[PDB]
Amino acid sequence: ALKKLNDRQRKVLYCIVREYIENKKPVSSQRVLEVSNIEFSSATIRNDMKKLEYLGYIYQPHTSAGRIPTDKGLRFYYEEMLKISMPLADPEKVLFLAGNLLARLTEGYVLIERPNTRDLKILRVMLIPVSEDYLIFSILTEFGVSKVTPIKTQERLNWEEIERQLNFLLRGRTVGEVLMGKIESLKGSGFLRLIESLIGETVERYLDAGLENLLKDETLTLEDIRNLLEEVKDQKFLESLVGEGITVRIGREIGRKKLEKFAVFSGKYFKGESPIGSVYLFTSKVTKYDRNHRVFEYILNRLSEYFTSTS
Amino acid sequence: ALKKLNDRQRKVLYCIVREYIENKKPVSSQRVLEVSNIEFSSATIRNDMKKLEYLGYIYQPHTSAGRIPTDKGLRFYYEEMLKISMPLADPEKVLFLAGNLLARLTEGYVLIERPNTRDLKILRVMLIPVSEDYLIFSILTEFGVSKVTPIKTQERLNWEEIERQLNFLLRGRTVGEVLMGKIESLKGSGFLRLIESLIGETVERYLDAGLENLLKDETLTLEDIRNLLEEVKDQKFLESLVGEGITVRIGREIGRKKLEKFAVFSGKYFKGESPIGSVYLFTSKVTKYDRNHRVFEYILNRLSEYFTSTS
Amino acid sequence: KLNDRQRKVLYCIVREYIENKKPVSSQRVLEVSNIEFSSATIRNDMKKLEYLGYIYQPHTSAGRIPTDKGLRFYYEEMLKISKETSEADLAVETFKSMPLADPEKVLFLAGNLLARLTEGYVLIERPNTRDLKILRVMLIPVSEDYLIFSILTEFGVSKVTPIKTQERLNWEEIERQLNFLLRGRTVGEVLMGKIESLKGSGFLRLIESLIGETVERYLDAGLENLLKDETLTLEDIRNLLEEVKDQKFLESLVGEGITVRIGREIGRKKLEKFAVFSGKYFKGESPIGSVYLFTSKVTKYDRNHRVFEYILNRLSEYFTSTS
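The joint structure predicted for all components is written out below.
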């Protein structure tokens, strides 16, 4: 498809898509010439815009004298811009901060898959009294210090003994095994069990951030946002989006009619060469692809340098 | 005793006692003749009754012509009367039905000791939504499903998650610990407070039934019944009554002067060869001992069969 | 004024409208109720209700829809009936601050349970940092590799943050330093940059960013609930997210004790589709912050009142017992 365009027609397409991203209006033949360095009159831009429309890169919705890039046009733009170019130990906090930064800087909606807990060994349990009134509970895992919980203590229990029992019971066993009810030391221990219910608390598969951002994008409707919220529950569908490395799916390329107004950036974060989790960034397909790819990359690499440095 | 009475005199004693149980009045020598097939003069029977009285088997009430058995007499009769020979899963329901059957068929007052709650481990806690409006609470113990309670719900919640929380807190603890206020985590919310009140409902150590029967039968006084109710509060008095297998104590054999008007059958119900509780049947000493023994043995055997099948 | 019967007719219409969300006809109110009067009589009552401004007629439909006045009437009558019986709301009674000691996590649980049970959007005002004295600074070495930082406040243990350390410094002495600098000073003073000595080393700079971590003044939850509600539009929701940033406006909503503002009662036309419950949570007699629940005004008012009041009372209990 691309090969049927001379250098000029590609500059014009690039300017059409670029101006549509900035101002979210249909772009006319005149408007191109106003903001462009093209050294040709408005008459040949019109011939060029007709070939672009015939080849499926742009289109005319209603009566407007301007055109709008199709999904094919947005893909051309994405490819063309590609050619041109804090010591935290709680994994949950690290994911939270990366999720919130990603969303904020791209005005998108983010889903970060938390590390699977099924194989996650508890290396150590810690109850640290801080005063007569408070203690701090946490666990040590290969990813750092997790489930950090300040606890108010009415009675002066034997914290050292409770800690000893916790480690005897839980050290070498997995967070996943606590969830399933597999730890059946039915001997008698009130605070031990309280703590087991914290380690056994249900955590959602994904951390989400920036739903607000979708609500202030003028290109998305309530219908679109609802559809995304439903589709994101289909776990198999999120799995089918994660290609080789960092990947985008613009509009129709997503393969769901309900999600046609979105683009999705997806990829994984790593501990060494082992995939720990997937990351998704949903925006309107009318977005700054350049900025989005740059932020997405910088966040996956930060996540990967954090999780790799805990070995 | 064994060699002191002849065949006829044993017969006369047996008849005096069967007839006393029956019509509850002093039996004369002429009455012995009328209710038996003894082929001797009433004069001979009266001489036999003289011997029976001298040896302590019968006695004269006031100045009436008839005689009544002493406790020794009733015991002789009991020994002589020996020679001549649905899938419910709630243990509390099974005990209640057995207690009331036992009471009705013997016209007595029944205590059934519940399984000791100090050793009664909670194996599982269940929170079953039946509709939008109701869920069913229960626990599993080694003896089945108990504390079964329908509870009203307004708004929905993920009750499966609440259930896991109840299981971390209670699985391996005993009903007795709940009852003694030992699970302080159960005061952490209104919901858990409700659960404590359900499992820790105020319960006597004995299921009682048939108190009304003690008032039906006219050989007993108001004071006799008051004394029985006081004396039955003494845990250690009841402990002492239970001999090897099924056993009766008539009158002075009970050991307490305040209860000399009663008789008590006692024995235990088993899970396999493990004794789980004691059962007591209190009647007037003027009662149908053969009927009582037969029913008492039958219910004990049913209680033991029930509890053994819970293995 | 209204009849006893006309009061019941208005009550049924509103209850039916909240439930099924369609105009309610005379024939409907007879089917759903045990009113013992004729179909013509109900229409005459509905004419009176409309004349007094309690209900309106959408287009050409035989059915009617409550006005804001009719919604207010309904709420007042449910409030009255809620003082005859008990609560018994199993779901909301699962709320526990349990033995949690982090006020942030307690606010998190409250906002999320409240949002979930009412299908609303919740804002909880966090305690004001301006007078939040730091009572103590803890630096606890859990191993060669890890350190746990936190501060003590009058409301519990905050800013709990595990830290990597690949090289051992003297932690007992650094904790002393931190306590000299920070104890008696407020979190507001740290955020404002008054404690200039915190930038004198790399670790001290870390501590300043952890205490001075960007925390929104309000914790929000349940935005998703507003999007599932068919009675609300995209514009209603954008309008809410915009107006909710106006603190002066939020403060004007809150009255004496727990109240609801329905539709026009809110004070801004852009928010006419909503109802807001508001109230404060306290440390003893001192208000610590306000709580706001926003829903569609087509909502289960009795449920929302009950849930809101329970949670607010729980927050007051947590903050007050942490005395």
